Amino acid sequence: LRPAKIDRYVDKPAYTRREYIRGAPGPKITIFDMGNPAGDFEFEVSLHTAEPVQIRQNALEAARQQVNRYLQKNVGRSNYHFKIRVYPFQVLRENPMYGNGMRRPFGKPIGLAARLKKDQKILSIRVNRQHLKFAIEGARRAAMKFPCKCYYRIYDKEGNDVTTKILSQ
Amino acid sequence: VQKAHSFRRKTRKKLSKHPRRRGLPPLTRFLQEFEVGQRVHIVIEPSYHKGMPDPRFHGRTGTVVGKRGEAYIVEIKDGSKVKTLFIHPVHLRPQK
Amino acid sequence: VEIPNKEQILADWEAHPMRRPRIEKVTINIGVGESGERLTKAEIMLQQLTGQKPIRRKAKKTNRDFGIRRGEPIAVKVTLRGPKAYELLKRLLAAVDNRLKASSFDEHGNVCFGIEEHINIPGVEYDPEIGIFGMDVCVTLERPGFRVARRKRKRAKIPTRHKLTKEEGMVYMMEEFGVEIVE
Amino acid sequence: AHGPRYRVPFRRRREGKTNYRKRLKLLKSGKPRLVVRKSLNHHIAQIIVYDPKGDRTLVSAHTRELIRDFGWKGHCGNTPSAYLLGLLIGYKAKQAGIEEAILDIGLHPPVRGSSVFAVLKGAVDAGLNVPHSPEIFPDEYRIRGEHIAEYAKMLKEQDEEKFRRQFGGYLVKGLDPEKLPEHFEEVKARIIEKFE
RNA sequence: CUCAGGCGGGUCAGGAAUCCGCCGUAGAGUGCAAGGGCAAAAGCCGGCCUGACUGGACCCGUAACAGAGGCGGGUCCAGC
RNA sequence: GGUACGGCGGCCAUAGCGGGGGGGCCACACCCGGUCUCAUUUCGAACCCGGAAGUUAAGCCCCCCAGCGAUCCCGGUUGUACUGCCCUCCGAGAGGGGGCGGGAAGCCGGGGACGCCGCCGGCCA
C-alpha cells in the first residue's frame, strides 16, 4: 500500500468509466448502512471535509469498522443509524515499474477512491439525545482515519444547525 | 498519435442535431434565395448530405458571388487567402 | 357469468345505434409447425372450409428444438369479414358447445378460442386433409367509427370512450349467440 | 409527448394532410401547382404559388359551383364531375393568364384511371399545359359516364329495390340515371360556350 | 408498409413454433469499428433498370493560417 | 358583412399527451354496395369505383382544465458556482485573495400556457 499522500489531491481528471478502463478492481467496501435506518432519531451528526480530497476505500473501510464497533459496543444496534454517503468511483492507477522506467508510463489500476469537494458530508450518525457524546466520539474516531482536516456538525430533523445549542446544553 | 484531418473528424457535437429537431427541416431554408453580393452565415444542416461544405468552415460568414446549378458560390477569407465554396442554400442563413 | 351493467349497456346501445359493436373480422389459424404434405393438406382443408385462398405464414427466427428454419412456411392463416364471416362464425361457435369461458375475453372485448377436431358444421374425414384439423379462431370486434385509426389520410386516434371493453364484448356476444361460463 | 427528447411532428403531418417530402420535390420546380383533392361528395382544384409566409391560391374552382351556374345534378364525386371540374379550372387558369402548372395529388395514391387524373385530363383539354403521360388517363367511356348508366341498367333489370337504394337521390333530384352521358355532354357544351 | 421490447387472449403449443388486440420517439434496423444522420424513411417488403457510362470545366481536403506530386470529395455543361 | 364549413400553407410542443361539455343550412365524415377503374403475397381490412337508407357514437368544429411533458415572466437560494485582465496580497502545500469587467445550472414559491398567423373557396346575407 503506497502512501495516501499520492492520491490525496484532486488535480487529475476524473477516471471512472468502467466501460473503457481495463482491469479496474472490485470495491473493497461493500457495507454503507448500519444500525436501524428505519427508526427515527432526533439528532444527526455529520462529518465534513475542510478541503477537496480523495479518500481511499481502505480508509473508508477502516473508519467504518472502527465507528461501527464503537457504536455497537456503546449505543446498541437498534439505537443508532450509521451511514457513509460517498462511494469510491475514482480509479487509482500506478506506473508499472531489466525493467523500463518512464517508458510507456500510463498506470495500471491499483485501487479505488472517493473524490469529495469542500465542506461535503462524508458520513452521518443518527442518534437521540442520550447518545450524542457517543456519536461525536465516533465521528472524531472516523476523522482520525482520513487524510484531510474534518469537522463535525449536529442537525435536527428540520436540518438546522444546532451544534452549539446541543454542546452548550 | 498524429491524426490527419478528415471530413468528419471531431464532429460529434458540431454535426449533431437537437433531439426535438430530428427529421426534415422546414422547407423555407431549402427554398430560400440570395442575390450576388449578399452576406450569409454558414450553418450546416446535418441531415442533408448534398452540397455540404467542409465542417471547418461552419459558423463563418461569407459573401455570395454567383450561383451554379442549385448551389450558391460563397467566398470566404481564411487568413489572407480567398476560398470559394459551393454551398446548398439549406446550409446558408442570411445576415441580419 | 354475471354482468352487472347489462341493462345499462343495452340502453346505451339502443339510445346510440352507432355505439353498437360489430364484428371487425374472424381469423382462423392452423399452426401445423412443418412444411410439406401436411401443410398442403391443411391449406386444402382451409380452402374447402372457408372458400378463399389461405396464406402460408413462414417462421420468424430459427429454432432447432422445433426443427424450423427462417423463411420456411410453418402455419396457415385465413381472415374473413362480412356476412360470410357471420355465417362461418355461427358454424364455428356451434361446432363446440356454445359456451365461452369468462377468462378469454380480451381487454377490448375481442375473443380467441380453439377447435381441436372437425366436430363442426358439415365436414368429413376424407382421405386427403385428414388429421390436419385443429384451429384457433379469433373474433375481433369493433364500433362503426373505427375506420379513422385505420385509414391513411387524416388518421387520428380513438378515445377510450369509443373503444370497446370486455363487458361490452360479452354483452354483444350474448345478444348474438352463445353463453358464458364461470369456468 | 413523454419527455424532453420526444420529437413532435409538424402540425400538418400530425393532422395527416401534408406530405412534406413530396411537397419539397414539387416546390423545387418553381412552377405553379395544380392541387387536386377529393372528398366523399365533391372535388377541389386549385392553382397555387409558393410564398415563404404561406402559399397563395391564384385560381380556385370547387365542384359545388357546377350545381349552380351551368347546372349539374349528377353526383359530384365521380369521374364525369372530376372531368368537368378539370375543364373549369383549366379555363379559369387560361383566363387568368397562367399557362403552365404541375399536378399535385397530395396523399392520394397514383392509381391510373382515378378522379385526380380525370381532373388532369379535363385541364389538359381545357388548355392548361401540364406535363403528363396519356397512359394514366381514365377511359373515355368512364369519363363520359357509360359505366354508371350500365350499372343503372343492370340494377333495373335485376331487383328493382337494389336499383332504388343505389340511385335513390338521383330520382329525387329528378335526373334519370340513364342519359347521364347526355347530361354531361350538355353541361360540357355549356361550359365551353361560357368560356369560349 | 412500420421497427425492438412489453402486456392481455388463443388446439396440440410449453420460457421459446403460428395467429388476434393494445401500449410502443425508435429503446430496432441501416454489410463490417465508432461517431453523426435517418419513421407516410435513408429501415422492411415488391416492380422496372445499370448513372458503378462517355467528352470536359470549376472548387474544397490530405497539406487551417501557409508552399505540393499522387489521391479522395463537392458543384456543374454536353451526349446516350 | 356573418358562418360550432372546407382546401393550400408559415412558425414546428407556451402548439404535445390525457380529460369534461356542446354542434351539425352548407360543408367534412362515419356509413350502404362491389358491374365497371383499381388491389389483396387471403380478406372492398387498406386503396379504388359507384352512392345517400341511417348517425352525430367519433374524425372534425366551438368552449374549458394544469395530472404528465414543454416553456415564458417575477421573487429567494445569489451576485452563490464558475470566469477575463493586473498584482511586491495571504498560504508549507493544495490552493485562495484584492481591484475592474461578466455571470450560471438545479431546487423552492407565485403567475402563464390545452397554440398564433397568411392566401383562397363553399353557404347565407
Coordinates of all heavy atoms in Angstrom, one line a residue, chain C residues 19 22 34 45 47 49 53 55 58 62 71 78 81 86 92 99 117 120 122 138 167 174 178 181, unseen atoms left out:
Chain C
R19 N -73.0 3.2 -31.5 CA -72.2 2.7 -30.5 C -72.3 1.2 -30.4 O -71.6 0.5 -29.6 CB -72.5 3.3 -29.1 CG -71.9 4.7 -28.9 CD -72.1 5.2 -27.5 NE -71.5 4.2 -26.5 CZ -70.5 4.6 -25.7 NH1 -70.0 5.8 -25.7 NH2 -70.0 3.6 -24.9
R22 N -69.8 -4.3 -33.6 CA -70.0 -5.2 -34.8 C -68.7 -6.0 -35.0 O -67.6 -5.6 -34.5 CB -70.4 -4.5 -36.0 CG -69.2 -3.8 -36.8 CD -69.6 -2.5 -37.4 NE -70.8 -2.6 -38.2 CZ -71.1 -1.8 -39.1 NH1 -70.4 -0.7 -39.4 NH2 -72.3 -2.0 -39.8
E34 N -44.9 -27.4 -39.6 CA -44.0 -28.1 -40.5 C -44.4 -27.7 -41.9 O -45.5 -27.3 -42.2 CB -44.0 -29.6 -40.3 CG -42.8 -30.3 -40.9 CD -41.5 -29.5 -40.8 OE1 -41.0 -29.4 -39.7 OE2 -41.1 -29.0 -41.8
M45 N -57.6 -28.1 -46.8 CA -58.7 -28.1 -45.8 C -59.3 -26.7 -45.6 O -60.5 -26.5 -45.6 CB -58.2 -28.7 -44.5 CG -59.1 -28.8 -43.3 SD -60.0 -27.3 -42.7 CE -58.8 -26.7 -41.5
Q47 N -59.1 -24.2 -47.7 CA -59.7 -23.8 -48.9 C -61.2 -24.3 -49.0 O -62.1 -23.6 -49.3 CB -58.9 -24.2 -50.1 CG -59.5 -23.8 -51.5 CD -59.8 -22.3 -51.6 OE1 -60.8 -21.8 -51.1 NE2 -58.8 -21.6 -52.2
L49 N -63.0 -25.3 -46.4 CA -63.9 -24.9 -45.3 C -64.3 -23.4 -45.4 O -65.5 -23.1 -45.2 CB -63.1 -25.0 -44.0 CG -63.7 -24.4 -42.7 CD1 -65.1 -25.0 -42.5 CD2 -62.8 -24.7 -41.5
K53 N -58.4 -18.5 -50.8 CA -57.0 -19.0 -50.7 C -56.4 -18.5 -49.4 O -56.3 -17.3 -49.2 CB -56.2 -18.6 -51.9 CG -54.7 -18.8 -51.8 CD -54.0 -19.0 -53.1 CE -54.0 -17.8 -54.0 NZ -52.8 -17.7 -54.7
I55 N -53.1 -18.1 -46.5 CA -51.8 -17.6 -46.5 C -50.8 -18.5 -45.8 O -51.1 -18.9 -44.6 CB -51.7 -16.1 -45.9 CG1 -52.6 -15.2 -46.8 CG2 -50.3 -15.6 -45.8 CD1 -51.9 -14.9 -48.1
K58 N -44.7 -18.0 -42.6 CA -43.4 -18.5 -42.5 C -42.9 -18.4 -41.1 O -43.6 -17.9 -40.2 CB -42.4 -17.9 -43.5 CG -42.6 -18.2 -44.9 CD -42.6 -17.0 -45.8 CE -41.3 -16.9 -46.6 NZ -41.1 -15.5 -47.1
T62 N -34.8 -18.8 -36.3 CA -34.6 -20.2 -36.5 C -34.5 -20.9 -35.1 O -33.7 -20.5 -34.3 CB -33.3 -20.5 -37.2 OG1 -33.4 -20.2 -38.6 CG2 -32.9 -22.0 -37.1
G71 N -37.7 -18.4 -43.0 CA -38.3 -18.5 -44.4 C -39.0 -19.7 -44.7 O -39.7 -19.8 -45.8
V78 N -56.2 -17.6 -42.4 CA -57.3 -17.1 -43.2 C -58.0 -16.0 -42.4 O -58.1 -16.1 -41.2 CB -58.3 -18.2 -43.7 CG1 -59.3 -17.6 -44.7 CG2 -57.6 -19.4 -44.2
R81 N -64.5 -11.5 -43.3 CA -65.2 -10.3 -43.0 C -66.6 -10.4 -43.7 O -66.7 -10.9 -44.8 CB -64.5 -9.0 -43.3 CG -63.0 -9.1 -42.8 CD -62.2 -7.9 -43.5 NE -61.4 -7.3 -42.5 CZ -60.2 -7.7 -42.1 NH1 -59.7 -8.8 -42.6 NH2 -59.5 -7.0 -41.2
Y86 N -69.9 -13.8 -40.6 CA -71.0 -14.0 -39.6 C -71.5 -15.5 -39.7 O -71.6 -16.1 -38.7 CB -72.2 -13.1 -39.9 CG -72.0 -11.7 -39.3 CD1 -71.4 -10.7 -40.0 CD2 -72.5 -11.4 -38.0 CE1 -71.3 -9.4 -39.4 CE2 -72.4 -10.2 -37.4 CZ -71.7 -9.2 -38.1 OH -71.6 -7.9 -37.5
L92 N -68.8 -22.1 -36.6 CA -67.7 -22.4 -35.7 C -68.1 -22.4 -34.2 O -67.6 -23.2 -33.4 CB -66.5 -21.4 -35.9 CG -65.8 -21.6 -37.3 CD1 -64.8 -20.5 -37.5 CD2 -65.1 -22.9 -37.4
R99 N -70.5 -22.3 -25.5 CA -70.0 -21.8 -24.2 C -68.7 -21.2 -24.4 O -67.8 -21.8 -25.0 CB -70.1 -22.9 -23.2 CG -69.3 -24.2 -23.6 CD -69.5 -25.3 -22.6 NE -70.8 -25.2 -21.9 CZ -70.9 -25.2 -20.6 NH1 -69.8 -25.3 -19.8 NH2 -72.1 -25.2 -20.1
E117 N -60.9 -30.6 -33.1 CA -61.2 -31.6 -34.1 C -62.2 -31.0 -35.2 O -62.5 -29.8 -35.1 CB -61.8 -32.9 -33.5
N120 N -68.0 -30.3 -36.2 CA -68.5 -28.9 -36.5 C -69.6 -29.0 -37.5 O -70.2 -30.1 -37.7 CB -67.3 -28.1 -37.1
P122 N -71.0 -28.9 -41.5 CA -70.7 -30.1 -42.3 C -69.3 -30.3 -42.7 O -68.6 -29.3 -43.2 CB -71.6 -30.0 -43.5 CG -72.2 -28.6 -43.6 CD -71.8 -27.9 -42.3
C138 N -60.0 -16.4 -33.8 CA -60.0 -15.2 -33.0 C -61.1 -14.3 -33.7 O -61.0 -14.0 -34.9 CB -58.7 -14.5 -33.0 SG -57.3 -15.6 -32.5
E167 N -66.6 -6.2 -20.9 CA -68.0 -6.4 -20.5 C -68.9 -6.2 -21.7 O -69.9 -6.9 -22.0 CB -68.4 -5.4 -19.4 CG -67.5 -5.6 -18.1 CD -67.7 -6.9 -17.4 OE1 -68.7 -7.6 -17.7 OE2 -66.8 -7.3 -16.7
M174 N -73.4 -12.2 -26.2 CA -74.6 -12.8 -25.8 C -75.8 -12.5 -26.7 O -76.5 -13.4 -27.1 CB -74.9 -12.3 -24.4 CG -74.1 -12.9 -23.3 SD -74.4 -12.0 -21.7 CE -75.9 -11.2 -22.0
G178 N -74.6 -17.9 -28.3 CA -73.8 -18.4 -27.2 C -74.1 -18.1 -25.8 O -75.1 -17.4 -25.5
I181 N -69.4 -19.0 -19.4 CA -69.3 -19.9 -18.2 C -68.3 -19.3 -17.3 O -67.4 -18.5 -17.7 CB -69.0 -21.3 -18.6 CG1 -67.6 -21.4 -19.2 CG2 -70.0 -21.9 -19.5 CD1 -67.0 -22.8 -19.2

